[model samples]
Target: TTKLKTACVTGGNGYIGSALIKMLLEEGYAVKTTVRNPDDMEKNSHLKGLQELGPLTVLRADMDEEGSLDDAVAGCDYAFLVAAPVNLWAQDPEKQQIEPSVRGTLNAVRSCVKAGTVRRVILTSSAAGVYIRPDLQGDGHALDEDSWSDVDFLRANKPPTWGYCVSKVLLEKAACRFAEEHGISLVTVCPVLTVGAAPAPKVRTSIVDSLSMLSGDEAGLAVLRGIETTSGALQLVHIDDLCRAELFLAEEAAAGGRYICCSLNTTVVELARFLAHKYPQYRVKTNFDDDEHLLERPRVIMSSEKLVREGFEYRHNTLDEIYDNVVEYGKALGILPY
Candidate 1:
């Protein structure tokens, strides 16, 4: 029998973290994950399903608490810093989003280095880290791993819901710096608007925003506009594909620097049309007469050529396939109504 490797995933209860843990277990890796309360059955009930898949360990760790990451990182072959503030509607951006993300990333890296067992750290960043502003994007210009958010412009504009983006940007920058300084192997994946089925039945923060917008809720519409104008395309990455990519990057020796993980780019009108067609019972506005010409907007294409060149293949290559799985799973779990 092949000896099982071990992996530590911070925020193991989350959408991405839970999926990553499931994949790790399937690959015969002993999985260790961090949660705010290790004994909170209510919070981690979804993880119980993964327990039957393979060896699983749950440890208590909080991002804000100093020295909390030590136990989670100890004796792990790979450490994935999937913990971050994804909520875009935070009242206190700094405390709720920024500090935890920045501090937690640094803390996780420090703990991994201290443990001396971790060979690599994979951070789950977002496209928000690279494609920040719509005005900066231009036609035929593709944002790649080397692209970064315009921090100075963001600071000047100061959008209310930009806390999440700021947090990711700061987290990636800090992680890259620390990893480079310590000569640690750190690979970052900046996935764009991750979609598809979540391992847990709980509502993911990012999805909540998307669903709200799809239902024509004012809050969701306002927030979406604040983040992206009519001139930018919203790219999407399937959750499972992202998890697979993370695993591939972890094991691949040639994987270095950051990689943009996205499969499709679509606009709000297109998304609305997709949802309407898929769920005809749901009434939504899919009219594009009032909408700007799709070609008029600057195409915000994020290239994953690096990941592709490294021999990573995406199974969920289309938005429809991704949403099909997500809607089915959501309904099965009673999170979505038929």
Candidate 2:
């Protein structure tokens, strides 16, 4: 009997990681996934539920702890680096955001290389890693795989919350340099604000957190306001589309370089109105001044021309379609009762 190809996913309990594991198992791959604590069964019960799909192994690994990833990557044919600190409002930017992201990324790659089994690595980067601030670009500019966020500019102009943005940029840069030096085949996917249902019960991604705040709670309202006022342009991709893109990139022999994964581009106010229309009971509200002007401005657009050219078609092609899946999942999870 032929041995099944093995794959490893870092941060197995995360939204993206759990989804990736399910897809990999559906494709008949033996899987290994790392969590910060495998013993915390209550937190990872959803991941455990996926065991019936295929051979699934869960191990304990932490981003901040050195060498925690070695065992997870060992004997894997493909490694997906999907784990990173997603906290946008971390108390210590350098400690909580930057260090773990940068260090964890490098450690995963190095462990794969050392294990001598991982032939390719797919790194889950973000649009923030490849996006330019709206202020820095002239009107009509579209960010693509070639564009990169200016770390220095972000440090100077943006707030501590922007630390998440800076960390992504830094992590991508390091991944590229390390791959080149080690002669490892690495493909990176930079996705925008991810949408659609998370595979697990818990909401781990920032996009979900942002969506959960639509219920008119004071803190939720404040978060919505902060996002509306500062987030100039928005791009969204369904979680399933992202998973397919990652799998496609992993399998395609010719695929290399960074790919920007996005489905829809719109402003924050328009997105709010779009959701509020369908889910009127959520009390979603937007207060953007001269919303028309914001709409008229060059929206932050990440070109997926490269991804399309590579023969991958996106199923969730519109914001409404993504929201349909997301809302249904939210309802099923009891997150969106109304």
Candidate 3:
């Protein structure tokens, strides 16, 4: 017997979810993972590797359908909701982001309540939720668990949408509100730009993909320059760190509140200079437009003190270490050409 440890993970095929499943199985847990369609996009391979590592199960559950969630949670002792749709395109902003993230969170929490076997629900939240407030950087204080996103300003500044940011903010709030009313044990992990190398050739690197958003062909130089222009600050954490944080939160969350998973912060110029020296191949880089970029760029400060104080250790505690590990891992995985 595998000790009867039943854990359900939503979006187990995703960047974070896949790693979560692997860690769960490696720790001797019988894991059940959910995706919209089990047969879709060779996603099964991500979890299949775990069969040899330990017990595994897959379920096809859509977040939009509330009824589909109950079956996935039934009899599971721990549940993780990591299935928010992350993309740049949103034809219908309201339906695309709000409905799925909010409804999905509700369904997951409700199922946990109904299952009666689940003790902990770890919601995959982003720093967007906590860092969105207008005064975040100006608060004259290091952001702790007490910060919040400004929803009114968020809603007003629609399209080129902060949909993902808003969704995370609202979803986490919804989780906390429901947990409080329903008396469910809930803990949220707020991670900054999650970047790192893929573990294998079959696995794609999320760090490079996201960096493209900030420093790729379309507007990478302009974007990076803009950040420098405005003196905007940003925080980031390796995907590996996020994974470790999630696993740690499973066992060590306080009651029901926010926890920062980001280890350090740096400006676009700082990152660009580091990348230029470290990689050397990055051309059309580091334009240094700090003033303009600082408009809404979050101040570069996040505390993992709560998590660390609880005995959790982070592999990369600084930007250089974090970025170097990513470059090295990507090369090993063949994601970067050496």
Candidate 4:
């Protein structure tokens, strides 16, 4: 009964999903979103605050539950498949993270087929799908959407967050196959280390991990250090920038296939030095010299030109400007000193 374009965002309670929902609603779309459990007030309460933005509908849906997405996807013009299992470590990575992620993508796409009116599905994938090939690190070639991570190597090596990388690789592939076979226009946005101001009840893990050095967490630094060792650089993108890309691809007719949404990549030593200089109070790990391991690493560049060539622009670009919001949010959330 509404003239507004309709959109269904999967995983509405999630950090990225919740942000996408807010963006869509503010854009005057009749937005419907799905969550594994809508009754969890502690988790979904933030979404309720977004109700005043526009015509917002919340439905109980689960990726693992068949037909759960049917009612939610019905009548929507665009479906943003933003839900997926996220895990850094697990006993059985395949069973716990990989399988569920791929399965959920299939289930969500099947619901779009049943709808028969959903025009496009903008899948929210990670850069893990595009940049995990250790051999290609520091080749000086800017990796694009056409590049895919080495799944076999990941499966065998089981690197930190390897499960996440593998699942993203498999699920993005599966989502594309399912959407293409059904004649649904599918555009996958592969974002790397999404960071932004705190919006959801819990800050996104990527942002938390990105700021680990500022908080003097060695374990967190170890995670980034490991990624730098393999991927060659710490690729990052603003969360709002990523959501804007999702909408940009959805509306642009020529947009197809996958688009990497990373904006910057820098070495761990540089990142630490930047952090230390920006926030003098935080004891960021900046004592390392050029001879150290992080300095000896190769810096592979992650390119997002495919999306930009389509006429997309980012509001937040610099590392200093981006991390300022994180620190501000940390203060408000009591994660950092006021």
Candidate 5:
């Protein structure tokens, strides 16, 4: 007899956090989520729309604060630790990014421990936490739950978004270790590039990646162009499927350990081909001679067999559906021509 499905999801305003909250509400669950400042109308305005979905609580809390997270999880049955700061280029990332993420994740878990009623903690760690090192598989090698991103490599090189990778890896591992020592039931879900729509007021990082070259956005083009020099092909999953898997892990009490939630692996050329054919209106490009980087690059495959075997089904499972939805959102959001 499963019961009292109340949940606390940190970072309610984020793209993933907002989507998950919507899903939880639609499924008839009482939900509570946190934001740093509830009074900031610009950031918190979108949340007012979610209140209509179901009973939801938006609390003010900071990870850096001593008892903020503890207060956020007071009576919830499940705590989703999803919030973390992202400053990839911070000159002092350990100060700007790493310390806070690891500290925040640990703080959230400690709050769950204090609650006594929280049965499970669903942690969000990116596939970025699992990849980015010299020895990683590039010849179609599939990275799975057992793999981890290199901390030393990140610390030493400090590649673009390097600190982000380091923080993700360390925070998840530290949280797991802490949960083990504290005897808490915790599950880690490592999701790859999540595409499609978002409820957040601003464009999401993943959507930016998807629309980069197609929308002729210079910042996105710069980010995507860097991938050609490295083994930067990607695996993708829609937010709908990602949120479903998070709930699946949280609800199934026995499902423990880390799980990768990637749907399919793909490359730049393949993506351009799809966009170029489907929508002739955009600036999607398939031809390349003057462009310095090769259009086609080898991908590092990722496996979601663990998640799939656990009976989690991906409803939005195809590439076509994901991009179509992203394009629709892009146009609706005025990032693309209407």
Candidate 6:
């Protein structure tokens, strides 16, 4: 039989989940993970391998399936709910995205409370919940956990964002509500533009990553132009730095408040210029002004002073590092030309 100090990580095969699970194993915690399919052992061999280190068990749970979560969460000390239905085309946006994110969080918390063995839950939320507006930090409005992305504005103006960002907002809100209602402990990690080299090639199909690069409030090129045309600001984070923040918040000492997990604050133009100097290929697009094109703008970088004071450190601190790593990964995989 495996030892105690168990952790149940739903969606443990995912990018962040996989990273978190590996870290948990190294930290000497018994890990139990939930996947969409319990029978697909070959597809989820990573979780199975962690069992060799301590106690690791993988079970099945589907957010769309009611009551499917209870069995997966049973017998764990803490559970992390990171899975949400991420589809762009749904019959009903609220039913598909908002309902799942909000309801899923409620169900997970309810399951933890019902199981009676679980003490806490860590949710993978997004900065979309915090900084959904591009002008949120305007005129001395420095956002913290208390501020929220105006959902009505997001829903009305940004239809593309309606599903994903709303879902994130709902999840973060729901988790907080859960904590309040049941008096259960919950911590949320609000990340932005989680850019990283996926562990496997198959993981690159995320709509969130693609959308931010292509078309979103924080969409690299779009932010550059809006600043060039209207003059403004933005913020972003490295996926690796985000990972560190998530892990930092996962531990017990982290305050119950939401932590903004971001590293560098820059625009797409700056990113393009940096990449242009480094690669000089792919013609990385830039929205700036110069003799040719130069952009002078600053982003409202999310503060990590709170977590740093508590002893959390980041490996990838800048967009340059993130782009370099991901570009190299993309090049190696033939997704981009070197």
Top candidate by TM-score: 4
Q: All models: lDDT?
A: 0.77, 0.78, 0.69, 0.82, 0.80, 0.63
Question: How far off is residue 281 in model 4, in Å?
Answer: 2.3
lDDT of 1 by residue, 1-338 (tens): 23568899998778888889998999889998998886776568888888999988888888767678888788889998888767676888778888888887888888888888888999989888887754554567677787777667666676665777788888999999998898889999998777777776565455654554345556765555443462267677788889999999999988998999988777666676678777777666666576444333436667889899999988877667767566565555554455
Q: Evaluate model 5: give its TM-score.
A: 0.93
Listed in order, each prediction's TM-score against the native is 0.91, 0.90, 0.85, 0.94, 0.93, 0.80
Q: Pick the candidate with the highest lDDT.
A: 4
A best-first ranking of the candidates according to their lDDT comes to: 4, 5, 2, 1, 3, 6
TM-score of 6: 0.80
Displacement of residue 125 (Cα, Å) in model 2 is 1.2
Worst 10 residues of 5 by lDDT: 225-234
Q: Candidate 1: where are CA atoms >4 Å away?
A: 1-3, 134-138, 210-227, 288-298, 332-335
Clash pairs (backbone) in predicted model 2: none
lDDT of 2: 0.78
Error of 2 at 158 (Å): 3.6
Whole-model alpha-carbon lDDT for candidate 3 = 0.69
- Score candidate 4 by lDDT: 0.82
Residues 12-121, model 6: lDDT tens digits = 66766766676677777888788887566545655556667667777788766666778878888777777766664465778777887788777778887777777777
C-alpha RMSD in Å of predicted model 2 compared with the true structure: 2.5
Error of 5 at 23 (Å): 0.2
- In model 2, state the lDDT of residue 6: 89
lDDT of 5 by residue, 1-338 (tens): 13547899899888788888888888888888999888887667778999998888899998777678877788899988878887767888899999988988888898899998898999999888876756864466666788788889878877787888889999998999999999999999999878778676654577777687678887776655544334356567888889999999999967999999988677666777777888878778777664654435555677899999888888776678666588777776667776
